[PDB]
């Protein structure tokens, strides 16, 4: 990607999503009539967080990833007030909204999303990229209904030492992360297990009223299953949520899991 863009090249449309830093907009590039999404971040907002460098890492990382299950970053640009990220547009919205709607998914839709996810995380990890923010408000759906990892804000290079006052919120964070320790690609395997549970049950398995209690649930790995969660599903999830990262499966074993294979349409 070569030429420099600017706001004047784009017609901005419907707001897709909101945020403190800024909003995501449907937009159309005037010359090609190309439909995409523009994420607009205020320079004056993001300096306060010291995240300007993590934004630069998010941009560097996401633009260099090519995967059907990862949301493209085409490029970026800035001006006086704000910063613009030029994104692939995922027409069906977030997995979060799907989940609010259906209230929870079935084993076939779940195992398929888990498959699209695992495939994507394989790609990333081969590049030694850890996501660490994996969660349904960060996951989008393409035209065909396929899962796409969207928001790379917290992704990092592996391994990582990071204690970040926010690496993005507790329900999806593994014990080694919340406890401020060293971590690796095993982080996303835990998160995959949290997500798998949220898909079937409709709520993350560590959910609680306060951060302090959720913190307790995570570090103690305290979760229970509703009667309707099948043993195959229980088994994969129990395999993924392990306090000891090294006892978590490789994505290969995830993709090869009996319940995944019996269920995934992909
Ligand atoms: O109508 C909708 O609700 C709708 C329709 C299409 C969408 N598709 C879409 N495409 C690219 C980026 C993007 N950002 C975004 C927006 C809102 C929330 C989360 C994100 C994420 F995931 F990128 F961070 N959303 C998003 C939302």
Curated annotation (Swiss-Prot):
The keyword Cytoplasm applies. It is found in: Cytoplasm, Cytoskeleton, Microtubule organizing center, Centrosome; Cytoplasm, Cytoskeleton, Spindle pole; Cytoplasm, Cytoskeleton, Microtubule organizing center, Centrosome, Centriole; Cell projection, Neuron projection. It catalyses: L-seryl-[protein] + ATP = O-phospho-L-seryl-[protein] + ADP + H(+); L-threonyl-[protein] + ATP = O-phospho-L-threonyl-[protein] + ADP + H(+). This is Aurora kinase A. Belongs to the protein kinase superfamily. Ser/Thr protein kinase family. Aurora subfamily. There is a cross-link at residue 135 (Glycyl lysine isopeptide (Lys-Gly) (interchain with G-Cter in SUMO2)). Changing residue 212 to A: Reduces binding to MYCN. Changing residue 151 to N: Abolishes cilia disassembly and kinase activity. GO terms for molecular function: ATP binding; histone H3S10 kinase activity; molecular function activator activity; protein heterodimerization activity; protein kinase activity; protein kinase binding; protein serine kinase activity; protein serine/threonine kinase activity. The lineage of its organism: Eukaryota, Metazoa, Chordata, Craniata, Vertebrata. Activation of CDK1, appears to be an upstream event of AURKA activation. Phosphatase inhibitor-2 (PPP1R2) and TPX2 act also as activators. Inactivated by the G2 checkpoint. Inhibited by GADD45A and p53/TP53, and through dephosphorylation by protein phosphatase type 1 (PP1). MLN8054 is also a potent and selective inhibitor. Activated during the early phase of cilia disassembly in the presence of CIMAP3. Inhibited by the small molecule inhibitor VX-680. Part of a complex composed of NEDD9, AURKA and CTTN; within the complex NEDD9 acts as a scaffold protein and is required for complex formation. Identified in a complex with AUNIP and NIN. Interacts with FBXL7. Interacts with CPEB1, JTB, TACC1, TPX2, PPP2CA, as well as with the protein phosphatase type 1 (PP1) isoforms PPP1CA, PPP1CB and PPP1CC. Also interacts with its substrates ARHGEF2, BORA, KIF2A, PARD3, and p53/TP53. Interaction with BORA promotes phosphorylation of PLK1. Interacts with CIMAP3. Interacts with GADD45A, competing with its oligomerization. It comes from Homo sapiens. It is an enzyme of class 2 (transferase).
């Amino acid at each position: 990607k070569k030429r420099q863009w600017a706001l004047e090249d784009f017609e901005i449309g419907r707001p897709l999503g909101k945020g403190k830093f800024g909003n995501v907009y449907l937009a159309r590039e005037k010359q090609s009539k190309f439909i995409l999404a523009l994420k607009v971040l205020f320079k004056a907002q993001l300096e306060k967080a010291g995240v300007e460098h993590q934004l630069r890492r998010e941009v560097e990382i996401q633009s260099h990833l090519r995967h059907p299950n990862i949301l493209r970053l085409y490029g970026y640009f800035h001006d006086a007030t704000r910063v613009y990220l030029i994104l692939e547009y995922a027409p069906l919205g977030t997995v979060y909204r799907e989940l609010q709607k259906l209230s929870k998914f079935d084993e076939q839709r779940t195992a398929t999303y888990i498959t699209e996810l695992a495939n994507a995380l394989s790609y990333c990890h081969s590049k030694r990229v850890i996501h660490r923010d994996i969660k349904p408000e960060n996951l989008l759906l393409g035209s065909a209904g396929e899962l796409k990892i969207a928001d790379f804000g917290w992704s990092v290079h592996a391994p990582s030492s990071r204690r970040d006052t926010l690496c993005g919120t507790l329900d999806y964070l593994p014990p080694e992360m919340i406890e401020g320790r060293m971590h690796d690609e095993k982080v996303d395997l835990w998160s995959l297990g949290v997500l798998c549970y949220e898909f079937l049950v409709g709520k993350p398995p560590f959910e609680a009223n306060t951060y302090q209690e959720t913190y307790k649930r995570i570090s103690r790995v305290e979760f229970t299953f509703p009667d309707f969660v099948t043993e195959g599903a229980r088994d994969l999830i129990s395999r993924l949520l392990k306090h000891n990262p090294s006892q978590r499966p490789m994505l290969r074993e995830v993709l090869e899991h009996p319940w995944i294979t019996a269920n995934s349409s992909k």
